[PDB]
Write a protein that binds this ligand. Structure first.
Ligand SMILES: [Zn+2]
Ligand SMILES: [Zn+2]
Lengths: 21, 29, 29, 21, 29, 21, 29, 21, 29, 21, 29, 21
């Protein structure tokens, strides 16, 4: 999930785009 | 664009930055 | 609680404080 | 909707609860 | 309304959200 | 105190109202 | 330091950075 | 007071120190 | 990404999300 | 410069990358 | 002025507060 | 560096002035 991808691991803005409508 | 730890309020602020007027869903489970 | 005047990222902050790790939807129209 | 209302008018934390998951 | 850990700056931002123009006291000791 | 109640333990907005003027 | 123009939650943030865990009073008139 | 001043005018971090506990 | 309207401290927040611990320069003209 | 542009106009996250170290 | 731990986004927000229109450099290495 | 001075150790606003232009 987003927490695993971005908070516990690391992400940049491209992965965050996955959660936009 | 750097990859970094984004958690909690900082994570939803980043979603706002990237998504803006498109909206987003924050569903950490 | 006091009523709210919340624009931009301030609304997102408020949704996080109301919902937290339950998650939420930020849905402009 | 809520996003517009909170910015042009005022809104309640009670209204914001309807947007939780 | 979710119960969550609210610390430091995030805690006083939440006090601002709830209290607003009433004002508040932040006295952690 | 507020740190114990809200930061080390957990609180929601109702407990925070205790610290409003 | 530079002078400040601080409205809403930005003033609270500034009080936290000046005072910290000493605590502070946010007191609109 | 300070809250008004900082928003309608300008204010100093030195003034803010008078509001610490 | 969406285009940005960023004033004051919001620009700094955005630079941190773009650059992170790489660092950055905040350089008004 | 960028600081002015982002506030009076609009700006891109792509532009912001030119300010990293 | 209190001495405190200022990290990440909170550290660059504090640099904004102190430096403002002078600008700043955030170069953590 | 600034991380050592201000994040791992502690600093106040006077030390932060060192990183202004
Ligand atoms: Zn703001
Ligand atoms: Zn934080």
């Amino acid at each position: 999930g987003i927490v695993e991808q971005c908070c516990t691991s690391i992400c940049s803005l491209y992965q965050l785009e996955n959660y936009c409508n | 664009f750097v990859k970094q730890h984004l958690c909690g309020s900082h994570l939803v602020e980043a979603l706002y930055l990237v998504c803006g007027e498109r909206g987003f869903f924050y569903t950490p489970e």
